[PDB]
């Protein structure tokens, strides 16, 4: 009828509709997957994930200029996709680096991030030979120096910058004094003080400048300002140390935050266009200050891992709730909740939800997809439409849950993690099995 | 000097200072606790907890009238404490029931909650002989009644109401149409419809009405109006069924949300006083409509498990961030983060945090206790104060993390769940061990 259309910018590349009207991913009907693997279920469309890997890499000239941000979603299978498609991998803590290593990720294609890197983390990284570390404090620079000098290597590093730009969807805020934990201020001199300290020692070596300015960005405008303010530092450093000790700072890392479509109306720019533009503004901005254009590096998380995966639920309860003297809201309770998708409660995110186990001829009715936790705020999709005949047993899917949902998953109310499955050219396979009661108790020490 | 005083209403009841000025819990210096067990670390003052159980029990007449809300924090060890203290236990999903059972908590004393109970969950609960189930939809009534009949029993049952009172700290909102997922509206007739269904079944027995109206409540005003609306439903229920079928509805459960002190300035009423007003609100309101007073039940989660415990961290980085042309904010980055305490990001919570490894002279400086994840919003304490000589390797501790902290814990950025440890009179045992790279990978297949 009208809730039937599956906006292609929102749903995985390989979504189709059955002859019996069952939504399918990679040739497999979602009903099949719920019978085989249970619900709730995370369903990853592997070709989608790889596709986006490939489209981004082409857009920026090389998969090497594209670092996947592990925090969006990480496991061995994914580390292995990243590796195969030739991108780099951005890990953020000791734990992330471990997993990437356990999955035999090339450690020269790993960059390590973080505002509070411990000593053991910095050690373990040069020990495996990570080969970029984006430093975030004077203290980390001191530690990294000792540690690296001790190992008899020269660690390539980037310094993380605050340029006071914060971008989201179609706007951005600029501030005199960015008030957050990451990076070093350009304007207050802290960043230049750091650039010096890194020049003072022989055990580190500054190879670029990093800036991360937001998420869910749909415009290039904020990157342009951010890039201007970053290249501005570059100017300052060749102005104090002359183009020679500086020739080797040839990378500008503009971070991630490249947005995706959670809702049909969401209109992030095709990656190719976006990339062409950024490349232009990096080249205009560096030339208009007397400097050879540096290479552009970005760090996508979501824009790779997000659209390809969907979360499949089973309707359990359907309750009509009166919200005014005339109007109602259809609360449809589902298999999971803030345990596998906290994004709605935590960031006020908005998702798209659809009936997938069949096609309904019933009219659209206003609705709330909620979960099963004992908390009124356990809402998965705050505002949507649902066919009037939605009923227990039906299966629904929430789109674009591949980034940030599982990584943030918890065991609230002792609800185990859902299973994760990948589907590819007709074939599904369990990647991350579903937690069980034994898992829930595994930490308990008798 | 003033960052030195540990308010007694905020920190666990057995908190003290060393002769060398180190903070201790039930007699163990925190710094000692840190070297054996590591940080991040949950330290539970076991005796504060039991102490909290006994007091509440005493106020509302008996442990039978106080059900502890598992969702706040649950493991076998805690299940055992609640049991030993003679209270009941509210569980919310299958997993919560399972753990309680494994800890062989007495099922007569368990009560099952939830907005979307599954057929299997309700089946398991009748099998275990659960004893009370608070029903939330007409669908649950059909499902439950069948399940009880097949098992040959009559399941006692309360109905969850929506009375249009939402309460927080020193105020409450009233609404004509409460717009949330739980319960059955009284004003709409949804509640009567439910009461009527339960009376009409063969296999259910209605023994009370249930109402939960908020969180962090400090006034009794919201409870008053609630009980009023709630007991007004009882008044209808004898205007239909007359008194003889209604003298089985003998329990009014007013939910939880009883408040606690996160900051020194927080003034929740002392439990013995609260109970006594609520007891009299129920008797005044109960005869006001010609009924004999039902017994009052209450459902604290936070008020039991909250204050007893704290979270111990190790400062790793200290950055001084310019937030104004003249002002500064001391970013003190720490050992875990939103993974072990998401409340600040999720609800905008406000916590106390103090230096505990030692005493300082240095004057207090404005600060933000921040975590180690690759996200700017990874903030544990947004607005506090730290001694100016604060430096890495120091130990700080955050008060009142006993409730909804570890329950909400995730593995964001593969940061494993901290260890949880109980301390009773100079002795400290491990309760929940800390996760490791193996637990991180424990759901991987191949
Ligand atoms: C989170 C993060 C990213 C990725 O963010 P997305 O919005 O998911 O694209 C990239 N770089 C850094 C430093 C980050 O913290
Ligand atoms: C959360 C909850 C409680 C207790 O809440 P606290 O604020 O932690 O006291 C009681 N009953 C129900 C049904 C709940 O969901
Ligand atoms: N908001 C509380 C739980 C309230 C439950 C509302 N039905 C928490 O901190 O988790
Ligand atoms: N506020 C962001 C979350 C950022 C995730 C990591 N920096 C969003 O739109 O979801």
XYZ file of C-alpha atoms in Angstrom, chain A residues 70-72 74-77 80 91-96 98-99 102-103 113-118 121 136-137 139-140 143 160 176-185 187-188 190 314-319 321-326 329 331 333-335 338 342 345-347 368 370-379 382 392-393 404 406-415 417-418 430-435 437 439-446, chain B residues 70-72 74-77 80 91-96 98-99 102 113-118 121 136-137 139-140 143 160 176-185 187-188 190 212 314-319 321-326 329 331 333-335 338 342 345-347 368 370-379 392-393 404 406-415 417-418 429-435 437 439-446:
216
model
C 36.270 0.087 14.479
C 34.065 1.556 17.138
C 31.083 1.521 14.761
C 34.040 -4.694 15.217
C 34.632 -8.379 15.253
C 37.099 -10.741 13.541
C 34.886 -11.206 10.430
C 38.956 -9.506 7.811
C 41.323 1.157 16.835
C 40.708 3.063 19.922
C 41.560 1.004 23.042
C 43.708 -1.874 24.167
C 40.750 -4.192 23.654
C 40.072 -3.135 20.064
C 43.734 -7.053 20.672
C 40.797 -8.169 18.511
C 43.716 -11.838 16.972
C 42.228 -11.587 13.466
C 43.271 6.666 18.698
C 42.307 7.744 22.195
C 42.259 10.489 24.773
C 43.602 8.254 27.590
C 45.935 5.706 26.172
C 47.528 3.718 28.987
C 48.340 0.126 25.342
C 46.095 13.587 22.065
C 48.089 15.042 25.037
C 51.512 13.291 28.614
C 50.880 10.734 25.846
C 55.055 8.238 27.232
C 44.888 15.539 17.009
C 36.100 30.305 20.092
C 37.045 27.712 22.612
C 36.062 24.114 21.801
C 35.214 22.623 25.237
C 35.730 18.835 24.938
C 38.320 16.108 25.922
C 40.000 15.403 22.594
C 42.811 17.125 20.851
C 44.958 20.177 21.290
C 43.824 23.746 20.620
C 44.437 28.952 18.634
C 45.747 28.672 22.254
C 48.741 23.995 22.656
C 9.277 -10.214 16.520
C 6.148 -8.345 17.599
C 5.098 -9.686 20.965
C 2.488 -7.196 22.216
C 0.334 -4.561 20.534
C -1.346 -1.910 22.743
C -2.576 4.004 23.920
C -4.781 7.143 24.144
C -2.728 10.300 23.916
C -5.492 12.849 23.546
C -9.222 13.051 23.696
C -9.522 11.863 20.145
C -0.669 5.844 19.511
C 2.666 0.859 20.918
C 6.446 -4.096 21.619
C 9.194 -6.069 20.242
C 11.764 -8.781 21.015
C 17.594 -0.422 24.492
C 20.189 2.454 22.843
C 17.169 6.850 24.044
C 20.816 7.912 24.201
C 21.165 10.346 21.176
C 5.881 3.613 18.735
C 9.279 -0.135 21.932
C 11.281 -2.884 23.574
C 10.745 -5.206 26.521
C 12.813 -3.649 29.264
C 11.260 -2.393 32.525
C 11.829 1.222 31.689
C 9.397 3.589 30.010
C 12.254 5.131 27.954
C 13.130 1.768 26.372
C 11.887 2.943 22.975
C 9.911 6.948 18.868
C 2.000 -10.621 17.509
C 3.966 -13.015 15.385
C 26.867 1.755 16.880
C 25.712 -3.843 18.723
C 28.941 -2.012 19.987
C 26.758 -0.276 22.563
C 24.703 -3.385 23.391
C 24.248 -4.224 27.019
C 22.628 -6.888 29.270
C 20.059 -4.559 30.747
C 17.458 -6.603 32.602
C 19.639 -9.641 31.790
C 18.854 -9.546 28.128
C 23.086 -9.944 23.005
C 21.310 -10.863 19.844
C 26.212 -17.148 11.927
C 29.004 -14.694 12.746
C 28.272 -13.889 16.334
C 26.189 -16.232 18.207
C 23.500 -15.195 20.612
C 24.250 -14.988 24.351
C 22.111 -17.722 30.341
C 27.100 -16.131 29.410
C 24.986 -14.058 31.788
C 26.495 -15.991 34.674
C 30.017 -16.527 33.317
C 31.507 -13.658 35.375
C 29.924 -14.843 38.568
C 32.536 -16.229 40.859
C 31.636 -19.074 43.231
C 16.526 -6.464 40.178
C 16.884 -4.207 37.148
C 18.949 -1.858 39.405
C 21.426 -8.264 40.007
C 23.754 -11.278 40.394
C 23.441 -14.532 42.517
C 25.297 -12.963 45.369
C 21.129 -14.304 48.158
C 12.188 -9.622 37.975
C 11.486 -8.308 34.605
C 12.549 -10.699 31.831
C 13.423 -14.347 31.391
C 17.088 -13.819 32.133
C 16.296 -11.959 35.392
C 16.794 -17.382 35.528
C 19.540 -15.847 37.549
C 19.899 -20.340 39.803
C 7.030 -7.562 35.577
C 7.204 -6.587 31.986
C 5.427 -4.907 29.092
C 6.005 -7.756 26.608
C 6.279 -10.963 28.425
C 6.780 -13.927 26.034
C 8.780 -16.463 29.975
C 0.318 -5.272 31.423
C -1.963 -6.043 28.486
C -2.876 -10.157 25.407
C -0.836 -11.083 28.493
C -1.644 -15.939 27.391
C -0.492 -2.403 36.112
C -5.216 13.303 31.079
C -3.653 10.725 28.752
C -0.386 9.151 29.857
C 1.587 8.404 26.731
C 3.903 5.475 27.569
C 4.006 1.758 27.022
C 3.254 0.407 30.477
C 0.020 -0.299 32.169
C -3.610 0.142 31.487
C -5.143 3.594 31.701
C -9.240 7.207 32.999
C -9.892 5.537 29.661
C -8.698 0.232 29.932
C 4.923 3.053 39.192
C 42.748 5.575 38.067
C 43.439 8.930 36.531
C 45.363 8.384 33.330
C 45.485 11.837 31.693
C 45.035 15.371 32.819
C 44.460 18.003 30.163
C 41.146 22.888 28.241
C 40.476 26.526 27.459
C 36.676 27.156 27.461
C 36.885 30.983 27.436
C 39.459 33.706 26.753
C 40.213 33.712 30.453
C 38.349 23.393 32.466
C 39.696 17.414 31.885
C 40.523 11.271 31.870
C 40.084 8.061 33.640
C 40.182 4.402 33.701
C 30.284 5.389 29.585
C 26.352 5.570 30.924
C 25.206 10.565 28.891
C 21.856 8.731 28.962
C 19.888 10.660 31.564
C 35.120 17.202 33.946
C 35.911 11.973 31.444
C 36.421 8.384 30.199
C 38.603 6.647 27.655
C 36.233 5.874 24.693
C 36.524 7.486 21.270
C 33.477 9.639 21.712
C 33.251 13.235 23.027
C 30.147 12.491 25.040
C 31.992 9.940 27.051
C 31.618 11.920 30.183
C 48.018 10.423 36.713
C 48.232 7.417 38.968
C 21.685 1.073 36.938
C 26.771 -2.115 36.003
C 23.263 -3.238 34.754
C 23.708 -0.820 31.844
C 27.305 -1.758 31.291
C 28.385 -2.439 27.741
C 31.656 -3.270 25.869
C 31.901 -0.019 23.970
C 35.299 0.115 22.289
C 35.901 -3.407 23.553
C 36.313 -2.154 27.152
C 33.158 -4.977 32.338
C 34.956 -3.886 35.481
C 35.933 -10.736 48.195
C 35.495 -10.762 44.452
C 31.845 -11.072 43.402
C 31.995 -10.543 39.633
C 35.225 -10.956 37.861
C 36.516 -8.588 35.253
C 36.138 -9.430 31.574
C 39.969 -10.581 25.788
C 35.025 -12.916 26.943
C 35.321 -10.294 24.189
C 35.832 -12.904 21.627
C 33.633 -15.503 23.293
C 30.739 -15.149 20.923
C 32.862 -15.443 17.700
C 32.249 -18.589 15.596
C 34.278 -19.383 12.408
